[PDB]
Write a protein that binds this ligand. Structure first.
Ligand SMILES: CC(C)=CCC/C(C)=C/CC/C(C)=C/CSP(=O)(O)OP(=O)(O)O
Ligand SMILES: [Cl-]
Ligand SMILES: [Mg+2]
Ligand SMILES: [Mg+2]
Ligand SMILES: [Mg+2]
Length: 780
């Protein structure tokens, strides 16, 4: 550990060639995304054999005995898989292959072509249907499979195709179809747009086609589904339906996908993945263009995956809310009322429902003060997700191959606030799949979202940043060794821990100086802390505190030897920080820093007097002192004022730093003090340490229990965390990098104190985070 471990690191990723390579990847990615963000190549989605076969059914509008879109028939004839099914070869999903193959077989028969393909398709369907022994064999179901497949299979039955209609699994599916159809409000089909519009081709006996146009989308589609629209067209001759089908053929050539457009969901998925891979800083322009488009279509009624959907989609809407808010757009959690009653979202195909609830769960964590609906959403999504873990569908072959249960479990144990940013990006680089397949009417892929380039850049960029930090850690530990701080043997040496506290969140190459000075100050502070609350005597501390007031090196002749040294190092670090800040800021700051240091250490001295008198403060007193004395404020200031290119006027600084006000530095200090207390008060109580916030409350409330006391501390912490979030994301003219630096340091602090049982901080978990974040690179 420390000096020896760090100087043994020799990362190759430091060489300029790696960053130059990463820049080529950045340019390639910009070029790849351009059609989706700026051009007309939006909605890049794979073919749906199933939908293509429905479009192929449409007879020529000139009345001739041939398809209106003969290129789709040609496509189908040419794209059968080796096993006789139609679908995407990379991924096998039984329900997808069954539905698509039966769909294709039937249209080839309609046009009396493809005898061989039909023969091979029928064999696939028969042979695979006979492999199903029980329900656990069926695997994940494509959208509305239970409704559509029995309908499509009855069409085959009327043609007397050689299929096993009498299998128990087939009877079960009809049973499931009835179950679904029974909850249907049929009269309302025509008045209130619903998810079933996506699959009208499966409920043809139910729909009065003469009334269904009322819920048609503006582009002529039925909930963006080519199959569903083709069906309505063949029943009605509706011009707008035909226009939709034409527009999709024009866009894709000789096939159609199972959803179109997916303009909103695709843009959001692109941004989500770029952000989670930790590569967002390279694509500010593209993220802004993408989110601006989404925001244009954002409305009080929510959004669908496609901007023309006549009903909102929770998945897209929850994702949109989170990414928009995170990027400082103004959105209200009131949009979630669109998914309530008397919360529902228990209808639809399983993967979509789970995705919607994962997204709702993550969105709920971005709550601002007073947003009760998000607390409700959090509770609801949590319960949903825990139940989903117990459902057999979650353990289907399809879901297991994608590690769904692992993903759900990870989401539930992960608090957005209590996250290490660099670590989350590293971890996502290890989970992201370039060939990820999604499910709707058929299995599909979105290559703008899931591709090799994203991952290539993710892993490389992570490794480069890490190697840069490793060189910085050599500088840190080298400075530390010669700094004099190791001479204070009453204090633990933790230079890497403090470097991690800042570098795990504020990682960009240009902020080397910020990280360096922040680490120096934190190293000094741990000594000052041990000195005031443990090692020093009150009379010694009174002397040190007077020296603090005087700012005079000559005055230290009066101090004990160890304090003479401590004062010298303190004085040097304070003024090095101040010089750097004045350089970056172009205005005087020595006086402001000095006042900050005095208030902080006078805070320690007040606490030292309490300890000496065995005084237990009121909770109000303890928190007041703690906000000032815990040390986060002066430490944060020591970093935030020396960020390359980040100008903070007094006016701007006061927006994020203002003792006595609920601004970023104040909230961080409050949260740090109380989170620490919740994590540590029990070990400290046992050791006989001076009272914490818990103990102070109990003195204030003699009859209250320890349990009530701890609950009260959390009742202070939780509101404070929401305010922190709002202060961070709030639109203003404070350089965002500065606000982010403050917020991210708070987030890493919260990681250290997460899950406060009172026992103490896990020193081993800290080491593991440092190892993961700063020591071990990603294999390429
Ligand atoms: C590094 C340092 C000690 C202070 C810098 C400010 C920081 C990072 C505060 C967070 C860690 C805490 C709670 C330190 C006080 S422990 P206790 O002495 O209150 O028990
Ligand atoms: Cl996959
Ligand atoms: Mg202390
Ligand atoms: Mg201490
Ligand atoms: Mg503590």
């Amino acid at each position: 550990w420390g000096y020896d471990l760090v100087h043994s690191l020799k990362s190759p990723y430091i060489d300029s060639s790696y960053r130059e390579r990463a820049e080529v990847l950045v340019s390639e990615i910009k070029a790849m995304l351009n059609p989706a963000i700026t051009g007309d190549g939006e909605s890049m989605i794979t073919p749906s054999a199933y939908d293509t076969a429905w479009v192929a059914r449409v007879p020529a509008i000139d009345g001739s005995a041939r398809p209106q879109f003969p290129q789709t028939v040609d496509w189908i004839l040419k794209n059968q898989l080796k096993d006789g099914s139609w679908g995407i070869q990379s991924h096998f999903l039984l329900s997808d292959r069954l539905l698509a193959t039966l769909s294709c077989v039937l249209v080839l028969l309609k046009w009396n072509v493809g005898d061989l393909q039909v023969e091979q398709g029928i064999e696939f369907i028969k042979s695979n249907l006979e492999l199903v022994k029980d329900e656990t064999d069926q695997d994940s179901l494509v959208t509305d499979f239970e409704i559509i497949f029995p309908s499509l299979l009855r069409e085959a039955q009327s043609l007397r195709l050689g299929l096993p209609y009498d299998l128990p699994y087939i009877h079960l599916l009809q049973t499931k179809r009835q179950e679904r159809l029974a909850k249907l409000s049929r009269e309302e089909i025509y008045a209130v747009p619903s998810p079933l519009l996506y699959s009208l081709e499966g409920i043809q006996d139910i729909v009065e086609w003469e009334r269904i146009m009322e819920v048609q989308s503006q582009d002529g589609s039925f909930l963006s589904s080519p199959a569903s629209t083709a069906c309505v067209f063949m029943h009605t001759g509706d011009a707008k339906c035909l226009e939709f089908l034409n527009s999709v053929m024009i866009k894709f050539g000789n096939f159609v996908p199972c959803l179109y457009p997916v303009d909103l969901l695709e843009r959001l998925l692109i941004v989500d993945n770029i952000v989670r891979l930790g590569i967002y800083r390279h694509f500010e322009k593209e993220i802004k263009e993408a989110l601006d488009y989404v925001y244009r279509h954002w409305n009080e009624r929510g959004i669908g995956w496609g901007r023309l959907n006549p009903i909102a989609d929770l998945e897209t809407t929850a994702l949109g809310f989170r990414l928009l808010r995170l990027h400082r757009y103004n959105v209200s959690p009131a949009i979630f009322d669109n998914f309530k009653d008397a919360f529902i979202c228990s209808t639809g195909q399983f993967n979509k429902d789970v995705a919607s609830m994962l997204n709702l769960y993550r969105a709920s964590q971005l709550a601002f003060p007073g947003e009760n609906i998000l607390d409700e959403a959090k509770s609801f999504a949590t319960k949903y997700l825990r139940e989903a873990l117990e459902k057999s569908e979650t353990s289907s072959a399809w879901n297991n191959k994608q590690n769904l249960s692992q993903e759900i479990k990870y989401a539930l144990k992960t608090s957005w606030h209590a996250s290490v940013p660099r670590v989350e990006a590293k971890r996502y680089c290890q989970v992201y799949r370039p060939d990820y397949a999604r499910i709707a009417k058929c299995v599909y892929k979105l290559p703008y979202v899931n591709n090799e380039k994203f991952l290539e850049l993710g892993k490389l960029d992570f490794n480069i940043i890490q190697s840069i930090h490793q060189e910085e850690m050599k500088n840190v530990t080298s400075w530390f060794r010669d700094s004099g701080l190791p001479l204070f043997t009453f204090a633990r040496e933790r230079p890497l821990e403090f470097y991690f506290l800042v570098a795990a969140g504020t990682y960009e190459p240009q902020y080397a100086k910020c990280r360096f000075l922040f680490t120096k100050v934190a190293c000094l502070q741990t000594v000052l802390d041990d000195m005031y609350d443990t090692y020093g005597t009150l009379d010694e501390l009174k002397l040190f505190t007077e020296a603090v007031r005087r700012w005079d090196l000559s005055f230290t002749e009066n101090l004990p030897d160890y304090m003479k040294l401590c004062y010298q190092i303190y004085y040097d670090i304070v003024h090095e920080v101040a010089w750097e800040a004045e350089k970056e800021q172009g205005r005087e700051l020595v006086s402001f820093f000095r006042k900050g240091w005095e208030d902080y250490l006078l805070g320690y001295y007040e606490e030292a007097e309490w300890l000496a008198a065995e005084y237990v403060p009121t909770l109000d007193e303890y928190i007041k002192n703690g906000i000032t004395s815990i040390g986060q404020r002066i430490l944060l200031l020591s970093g935030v004022l020396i960020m390359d290119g980040q100008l903070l006027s007094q006016e701007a600084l006061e927006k994020v730093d203002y003792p006595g006000r609920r601004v970023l530095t104040e909230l961080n200090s409050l949260i740090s003090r109380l989170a620490d207390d919740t994590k540590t008060y029990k070990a400290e109580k046992a050791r006989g340490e001076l009272a914490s916030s818990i103990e102070c409350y109990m003195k204030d409330h003699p009859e209250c229990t320890e349990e009530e006391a701890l609950d009260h501390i959390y009742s202070i912490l939780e509101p404070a965390v929401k305010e922190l979030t709002r202060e961070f994301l709030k639109p203003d003219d404070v350089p965002f990098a500065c606000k982010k630096m403050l917020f991210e340091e708070t987030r890493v602090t919260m990681v250290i104190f997460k899950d406060g049982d009172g026992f103490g901080v896990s020193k081993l978990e800290v080491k593991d985070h440092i190892k993961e974040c700063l020591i071990e690179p990603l294999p390429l």
